[PDB]
Write a protein that binds this ligand. Structure first.
Ligand code: ZLH
Length: 121
């Protein structure tokens, strides 16, 4: 109850579910800057799900809000890159975002409740 640390394993489980999703395929590893030579002209801060997982495992997120900001960057980097809707990878981005948001909602609410309970007195 009001466990301040519970978010970390809940985010590891949610990343496992995202790796199972066929829709994560394009987002599982950093973009090859040699394959996509212009990528860093458009994208200031590359992000992918393996980087998010390793940052979590390094103990380099202090809160699930920080992890949520990096996952949302994957989705906005994909939108910044799409030429049009006529792309399988843009279709996969929007479905995976909806799945992520549906599952992260309770992780954020529970964490923020726990900080409130810790400060209650
Ligand atoms: C650069 C794009 C979009 N993309 C990303 O934004 C991304 C984030 C993390 C890893 O990749 C996935 C790769 N992309 C492709 O077009 N590959 C498909 C090839 C036929 C062309």
């Amino acid at each position: 109850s009001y466990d301040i640390q519970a978010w970390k394993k809940q985010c590891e489980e949610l990343l496992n579910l995202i790796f199972q999703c066929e829709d994560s395929e394009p987002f599982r590893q950093p973009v090859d800057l040699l394959e996509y030579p212009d990528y860093r002209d458009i994208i200031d801060t590359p992000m992918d799900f393996a980087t998010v997982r390793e940052t979590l495992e390094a103990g380099n997120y202090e809160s699930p809000m920080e992890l949520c900001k990096d996952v949302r960057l994957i989705f906005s980097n994909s939108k910044a890159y799409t030429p049009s809707k006529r792309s399988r990878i843009y279709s996969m981005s929007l479905r995976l975002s909806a799945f992520f948001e549906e599952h992260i909602s309770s992780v954020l609410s529970d964490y923020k409740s726990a900080l409130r309970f810790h400060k209650r007195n």
